[PDB]
Design an enzyme around this catalytic site. Structure first.
Site, PDB file in Angstrom:
ATOM      1  CB  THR A   1      -0.985   0.027   1.170  1.00  0.00           C
ATOM      2  OG1 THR A   1      -0.269  -0.150   2.391  1.00  0.00           O
ATOM      3  CG2 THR A   1      -2.011  -1.058   1.033  1.00  0.00           C
TER       4      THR A   1
ATOM      5  NE  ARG B   1       1.428   4.581   4.325  1.00  0.00           N
ATOM      6  CZ  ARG B   1       1.104   4.624   3.038  1.00  0.00           C
ATOM      7  NH1 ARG B   1       1.411   5.675   2.275  1.00  0.00           N
ATOM      8  NH2 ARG B   1       0.454   3.612   2.527  1.00  0.00           N
TER       9      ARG B   1
ATOM     10  CB  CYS C   1      13.058  -1.520  -1.609  1.00  0.00           C
ATOM     11  SG  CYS C   1      13.389   0.095  -2.193  1.00  0.00           S
TER      12      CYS C   1
ATOM     13  CB  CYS D   1      14.846  -8.919  -8.983  1.00  0.00           C
ATOM     14  SG  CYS D   1      15.918  -7.489  -9.231  1.00  0.00           S
TER      15      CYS D   1
HETATM   16  N1  LIG Z   1      11.305   8.337  -0.742  1.00  0.00           N
HETATM   17  C1  LIG Z   1      12.414   8.092  -1.398  1.00  0.00           C
HETATM   18  O1  LIG Z   1      12.796   8.826  -2.277  1.00  0.00           O
HETATM   19  C2  LIG Z   1      13.190   6.858  -1.111  1.00  0.00           C
HETATM   20  C3  LIG Z   1      14.407   6.719  -1.782  1.00  0.00           C
HETATM   21  C4  LIG Z   1      15.139   5.577  -1.599  1.00  0.00           C
HETATM   22  C5  LIG Z   1      14.650   4.594  -0.729  1.00  0.00           C
HETATM   23  N2  LIG Z   1      13.480   4.742  -0.098  1.00  0.00           N
HETATM   24  C6  LIG Z   1      13.005   3.622   0.701  1.00  0.00           C
HETATM   25  O2  LIG Z   1      12.248   2.791  -0.187  1.00  0.00           O
HETATM   26  C7  LIG Z   1      11.314   2.004   0.553  1.00  0.00           C
HETATM   27  C8  LIG Z   1       9.975   2.092  -0.132  1.00  0.00           C
HETATM   28  O3  LIG Z   1       9.531   3.461  -0.061  1.00  0.00           O
HETATM   29  P1  LIG Z   1       8.039   3.891  -0.384  1.00  0.00           P
HETATM   30  O4  LIG Z   1       8.052   5.385  -0.435  1.00  0.00           O
HETATM   31  O5  LIG Z   1       7.515   3.119  -1.537  1.00  0.00           O
HETATM   32  O6  LIG Z   1       7.295   3.316   0.927  1.00  0.00           O
HETATM   33  P2  LIG Z   1       6.123   3.960   1.804  1.00  0.00           P
HETATM   34  O7  LIG Z   1       5.207   4.729   0.882  1.00  0.00           O
HETATM   35  O8  LIG Z   1       6.704   4.565   3.040  1.00  0.00           O
HETATM   36  O9  LIG Z   1       5.243   2.692   2.217  1.00  0.00           O
HETATM   37  C9  LIG Z   1       5.534   1.922   3.351  1.00  0.00           C
HETATM   38  C10 LIG Z   1       4.728   0.652   3.233  1.00  0.00           C
HETATM   39  O10 LIG Z   1       5.117  -0.217   4.310  1.00  0.00           O
HETATM   40  C11 LIG Z   1       3.985  -0.614   5.013  1.00  0.00           C
HETATM   41  N3  LIG Z   1       4.256  -0.860   6.441  1.00  0.00           N
HETATM   42  C12 LIG Z   1       4.828  -0.013   7.299  1.00  0.00           C
HETATM   43  N4  LIG Z   1       4.789  -0.526   8.549  1.00  0.00           N
HETATM   44  C13 LIG Z   1       4.153  -1.726   8.466  1.00  0.00           C
HETATM   45  C14 LIG Z   1       3.757  -2.749   9.405  1.00  0.00           C
HETATM   46  N5  LIG Z   1       4.071  -2.607  10.700  1.00  0.00           N
HETATM   47  N6  LIG Z   1       3.128  -3.836   8.939  1.00  0.00           N
HETATM   48  C15 LIG Z   1       2.829  -3.953   7.644  1.00  0.00           C
HETATM   49  N7  LIG Z   1       3.147  -3.046   6.681  1.00  0.00           N
HETATM   50  C16 LIG Z   1       3.789  -1.926   7.088  1.00  0.00           C
HETATM   51  C17 LIG Z   1       3.027   0.572   4.824  1.00  0.00           C
HETATM   52  O11 LIG Z   1       1.681   0.242   5.195  1.00  0.00           O
HETATM   53  P3  LIG Z   1       0.477   1.268   5.350  1.00  0.00           P
HETATM   54  O12 LIG Z   1      -0.065   1.548   3.967  1.00  0.00           O
HETATM   55  O13 LIG Z   1      -0.476   0.378   6.144  1.00  0.00           O
HETATM   56  O14 LIG Z   1       0.966   2.532   6.049  1.00  0.00           O
HETATM   57  C18 LIG Z   1       3.230   0.836   3.371  1.00  0.00           C
HETATM   58  O15 LIG Z   1       2.590  -0.217   2.630  1.00  0.00           O
HETATM   59  C19 LIG Z   1      11.305   2.582   1.971  1.00  0.00           C
HETATM   60  O16 LIG Z   1      12.032   1.734   2.859  1.00  0.00           O
HETATM   61  C20 LIG Z   1      12.051   3.885   1.829  1.00  0.00           C
HETATM   62  O17 LIG Z   1      12.751   4.304   2.999  1.00  0.00           O
HETATM   63  C21 LIG Z   1      12.704   5.833  -0.293  1.00  0.00           C
HETATM   64  O1  LIG Z   2      16.979  14.668   0.329  1.00  0.00           O
HETATM   65  C1  LIG Z   2      16.257  13.672   0.585  1.00  0.00           C
HETATM   66  O2  LIG Z   2      16.691  12.597   1.038  1.00  0.00           O
HETATM   67  C2  LIG Z   2      14.768  13.800   0.293  1.00  0.00           C
HETATM   68  C3  LIG Z   2      14.149  15.043   0.346  1.00  0.00           C
HETATM   69 CL1  LIG Z   2      15.029  16.418   0.900  1.00  0.00          CL
HETATM   70  C4  LIG Z   2      12.821  15.185  -0.046  1.00  0.00           C
HETATM   71 CL2  LIG Z   2      12.073  16.736   0.011  1.00  0.00          CL
HETATM   72  C5  LIG Z   2      12.101  14.081  -0.492  1.00  0.00           C
HETATM   73 CL3  LIG Z   2      10.460  14.271  -0.983  1.00  0.00          CL
HETATM   74  C6  LIG Z   2      12.702  12.826  -0.543  1.00  0.00           C
HETATM   75 CL4  LIG Z   2      11.841  11.479  -1.172  1.00  0.00          CL
HETATM   76  C7  LIG Z   2      14.017  12.659  -0.137  1.00  0.00           C
HETATM   77  C8  LIG Z   2      14.609  11.286  -0.132  1.00  0.00           C
HETATM   78  C9  LIG Z   2      15.758  11.055  -1.008  1.00  0.00           C
HETATM   79  C10 LIG Z   2      16.216  12.018  -1.900  1.00  0.00           C
HETATM   80  C11 LIG Z   2      17.332  11.762  -2.661  1.00  0.00           C
HETATM   81 BR1  LIG Z   2      18.017  13.145  -3.761  1.00  0.00          BR
HETATM   82  C12 LIG Z   2      18.040  10.530  -2.639  1.00  0.00           C
HETATM   83  O3  LIG Z   2      19.006  10.276  -3.427  1.00  0.00           O
HETATM   84  C13 LIG Z   2      17.541   9.575  -1.706  1.00  0.00           C
HETATM   85 BR2  LIG Z   2      18.414   7.920  -1.553  1.00  0.00          BR
HETATM   86  C14 LIG Z   2      16.443   9.841  -0.903  1.00  0.00           C
HETATM   87  O4  LIG Z   2      16.081   8.879   0.029  1.00  0.00           O
HETATM   88  C15 LIG Z   2      14.992   9.070   0.853  1.00  0.00           C
HETATM   89  C16 LIG Z   2      14.626   8.068   1.790  1.00  0.00           C
HETATM   90 BR3  LIG Z   2      15.778   6.627   2.246  1.00  0.00          BR
HETATM   91  C17 LIG Z   2      13.378   8.177   2.576  1.00  0.00           C
HETATM   92  O5  LIG Z   2      12.947   7.288   3.314  1.00  0.00           O
HETATM   93  C18 LIG Z   2      12.627   9.418   2.374  1.00  0.00           C
HETATM   94 BR4  LIG Z   2      10.997   9.551   3.309  1.00  0.00          BR
HETATM   95  C19 LIG Z   2      13.027  10.398   1.547  1.00  0.00           C
HETATM   96  C20 LIG Z   2      14.208  10.281   0.744  1.00  0.00           C
END
Ligand SMILES: NC(=O)c1ccc[n+]([C@@H]2O[C@H](COP(=O)([O-])OP(=O)(O)OC[C@H]3O[C@@H](n4cnc5c(N)ncnc54)[C@H](OP(=O)(O)O)[C@@H]3O)[C@@H](O)[C@H]2O)c1
Ligand SMILES: O=C(O)c1c(Cl)c(Cl)c(Cl)c(Cl)c1-c1c2cc(Br)c(=O)c(Br)c-2oc2c(Br)c([O-])c(Br)cc12
EC number: 1.5.1.30
Length: 205
Positions: A11, A77, A108, A187
């Protein structure tokens, strides 16, 4: 070949599109969700829904039973607090996989686990520390584990045309959520990334 998969984090941002893509591609998909209202009505639908929590071993066990592989897209989240949710979830997933004979997991974390570790933004350090714990759990499990370590996850369209490197350098520092899901699924049909860390990225402009 892999036919039945469990997705954890279905989700979430990346999970939703990975789920839709997996169903559209023909997989028989089981998801574990805490709140089923977060699954969509429109579009492709999972074959099986387990309501429960990744921190509850019995809920994880029910989700992993009978699968061929597991995709892990857990995350926090918007919550950047200190956390063990992902690593404790991974511990439960590994235990369930071993209890049920499942040997393939694609999970991931983030590109921060490939890049200079002194260059993580302070606000993301606590989550990164738990990604490192989860990576350790999965690497030490002995199971066939593909570590997916993406950069920033964007909203750009699905392309299927991204590049995958093994070292965190690549054409960009962004991957669309759709492309990241597409890679997770790729994968499942190759062993070339088993035991490796992978860095998907693409230039969308
Ligand atoms: N944002 C970025 O740019 C970025 C970049 C690189 C890596 N990442 C990493 O990539 C991964 C995926 O990110 P995303 O943004 O797709 O994930 P996300 O939107 O934060 O979604 C998290 C998911 O994990 C579930 N979850 C959390 N706690 C749980 C629990 N206790 N039991 C069951 N399910 C649970 C959530 O459920 P609910 O829907 O029930 O809340 C949701 O389905 C994360 O680990 C994140 O840190 C993110
Ligand atoms: O500067 C940041 O990190 C950031 C900011 Cl500053 C803003 Cl505004 C937003 Cl929206 C996001 Cl998604 C991110 C971010 C992210 C950005 C870059 Br660039 C990158 O290379 C990587 Br790896 C990132 O890993 C993330 C993980 Br791990 C998370 O769990 C979340 Br939550 C957010 C990130």
């Amino acid at each position: 070949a892999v036919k039945k998969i469990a997705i954890f984090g279905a989700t979430g941002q990346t999970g939703l599109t990975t789920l839709a893509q997996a169903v559209q591609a023909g997989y028989e998909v089981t998801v574990l969700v805490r709140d089923s209202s977060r699954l969509p009505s429109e579009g492709p639908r999972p074959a099986h829904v387990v309501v429960g929590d990744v921190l509850q071993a019995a809920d994880v066990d029910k989700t992993v039973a009978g699968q061929d592989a597991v995709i892990v897209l857990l995350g926090t989240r918007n919550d950047l607090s200190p956390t063990t949710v992902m690593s404790e979830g991974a511990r439960n997933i590994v235990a369930a996989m071993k209890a049920h004979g499942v040997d393939k997991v694609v999970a991931c974390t983030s590109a921060f686990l490939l890049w200079d570790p002194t260059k993580v933004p302070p606000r993301l350090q606590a989550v990164t520390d738990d990604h490192i714990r989860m990576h350790k759990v999965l690497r030490e499990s002995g199971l066939k584990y593909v570590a997916v370590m993406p950069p920033h996850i964007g909203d750009q369209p699905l392309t299927g045309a991204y590049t995958v490197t093994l070292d965190g350098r690549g054409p960009s520092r962004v991957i669309s959520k759709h492309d990241l899901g597409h890679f997770m699924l790729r994968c499942l049909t190759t062993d070339e990334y088993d035991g490796h860390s992978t860095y998907p990225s693409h230039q969308y402009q």
